[PDB]
Amino acid sequence: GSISTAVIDAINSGATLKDINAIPDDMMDDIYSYAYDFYNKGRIEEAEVFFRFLCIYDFYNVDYIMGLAAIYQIKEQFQQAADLYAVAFALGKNDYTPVFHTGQCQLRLKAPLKAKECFELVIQHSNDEKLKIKAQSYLDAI
Amino acid sequence: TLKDINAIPDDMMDDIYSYAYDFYNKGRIEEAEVFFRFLCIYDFYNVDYIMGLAAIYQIKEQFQQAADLYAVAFALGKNDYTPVFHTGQCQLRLKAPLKAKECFELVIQHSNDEKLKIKAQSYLDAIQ
Ligand SMILES: O=c1[nH]c2cc(Cl)ccc2o1
Ligand SMILES: [Cl-]
Ligand SMILES: [Cl-]
Ligand SMILES: [Mg+2]
């Protein structure tokens, strides 16, 4: 998937498509909008192809990663979603939404201790008060 | 992954990992890089294998390539902030002090590793 592609690219350390600016920013913006057009109409498979395409070109992009993680979470591919949410957080650092969603994924992965750590981080560090309420409601049930 | 099909026994992979670190510790960087690349081909999902290759890239002053692997390495452990610490170092070398500051601050705010936080704080203290 997207992560193995990123790791292969780093191993081989050859020229990538982004390194040569093979797709301009404006076209990447268009494709991202098309990806969500598919997603918003429930065409999840096509959206996934488009977000995979975006993540091959520019993996280290919080917006592309978050789109793909959402798809995996909807498809109940919870480990793949949590892995991408963690990448997104490492790049973004200031938005705790991926940490919240990782907590949800860990709950489904039968890892309540990992989920608890996620929700507690949201509570202690997020300034999104509504997200904190949601995290607390998961914490109350664990 | 080749790991998924158990193409090489577990103990032999342990041996290869320890040999890679031997090369690294002896300054045999080119050989260590071959061995860590070998490991990461065998199992891209092994955080310690990725961290080894990232360290090689950082030593070779390929700071963006190192930072890219550190971001993957962080996701593959979720709770270990050491790759975030090293990313902060790489960002300083890339002349991105605000990005570096964010990394070291994240270590201090989330990590339970007290020795690592001590190191991150010493970087934060130095950043203008
Ligand atoms: O300690 C941590 N930080 C984390 C960040 C994400 Cl995205 C998930 C789990 C975590 O555990
Ligand atoms: Cl993958
Ligand atoms: Cl900066
Ligand atoms: Mg607060």
UniProtKB/Swiss-Prot annotation, chain A:
Gene Ontology molecular function: identical protein binding
User: What name goes with this protein?
Assistant: Chaperone protein IpgC
Compartment(s) of residence: Cytoplasm
- Chief subcellular location equals cytoplasm
Organism annotation = Shigella flexneri
Which stretches are annotated as coiled coil? none
Keywords attached to this Swiss-Prot or TrEMBL record, sorted alphabetically, are: Chaperone, Cytoplasm, Plasmid, Virulence
Q: Which domain of life is it from?
A: Bacteria
Which function does this protein serve?
Assists the correct folding of nascent IpaB. Once it is bound to IpaB, it binds to IpaC and impedes their premature association that would lead to their degradation in the absence of IpcG.
Q: Under the cellular component aspect of Gene Ontology, which terms does the record hold?
A: cytoplasm
Give the UniProt family note: Belongs to the LcrH/SycD chaperone family.
